[PDB]
């Protein structure tokens, strides 16, 4: 035999171990249309109809945005837009209400409830109206048969809708 001494400078006493991490995907859509009818006398919504262009998704990650258009997600080639249609606004008070409407993702439609929170109603600089509200609510991928190939382990069944609107009177 023969005795050696490590060259600590070119020796690595190393290990690799696999772990999981949970993270939130946050995103919006750059491109959408809405019709908003609101009565500031009573702080009631009268009509709220939104159309979102799936193509315009942005989750801060180019390769993921593309992947979202594919058959295993939005299938934007066949179903290029998602639509929301208000069916009912039930006032709680002037800051708060329960909105019920039809969401349609990739041709499948379900009625969902959003929590309307009016964060401010005003007359503008120019004497024409503004409003600022939010719509919050949880929907389930499974209720919309959405991204069914992807497990509820890898990706949560719960999607959190966070709609923030500043909006001005018309004509």
UniProtKB/TrEMBL annotation:
Domain of life: Bacteria
Keyword Signal annotated: yes
UniProt-listed InterPro entries: Lipid/polyisoprenoid-bd_YceI, TTHA0802/YceI-like_sf
Cited Pfam families: YceI (PF04264)
Domain Lipid/polyisoprenoid-binding YceI-like residue range list: 3-168
Assigned keywords, A-Z: Signal
Name of protein: Periplasmic protein
């Amino acid at each position: 035999m023969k005795e050696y001494t490590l060259d600590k400078a070119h020796t690595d006493v190393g290990f690799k171990i696999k772990h999981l991490q949970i993270s939130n995907v946050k995103g919006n859509f750059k491109d959408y249309s809405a019709v908003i009818d609101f009565d500031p006398a009573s702080a009631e919504f009268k009509k709220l109809d939104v159309t979102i262009k799936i193509a315009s998704v942005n989750t801060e990650n180019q390769t993921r945005d593309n992947h979202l258009q594919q058959d295993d997600f939005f299938k934007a080639k066949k179903y290029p837009d998602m639509t929301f249609t208000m069916k009912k606004y039930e006032k709680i008070d002037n800051e708060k209400g329960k909105m019920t409407g039809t969401l349609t993702i990739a041709g499948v439609s379900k009625d969902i409830v959003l929590d309307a929170e009016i964060g401010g109603v005003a007359k503008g600089k120019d004497g024409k109206e503004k409003i600022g509200f939010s719509l919050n609510g949880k929907i389930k991928r499974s209720d919309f048969k959405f991204a069914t190939s992807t497990s509820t382990i890898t990706l949560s069944d719960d999607i959190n809708l966070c709609i923030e609107v500043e909006a001005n009177e018309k004509e």
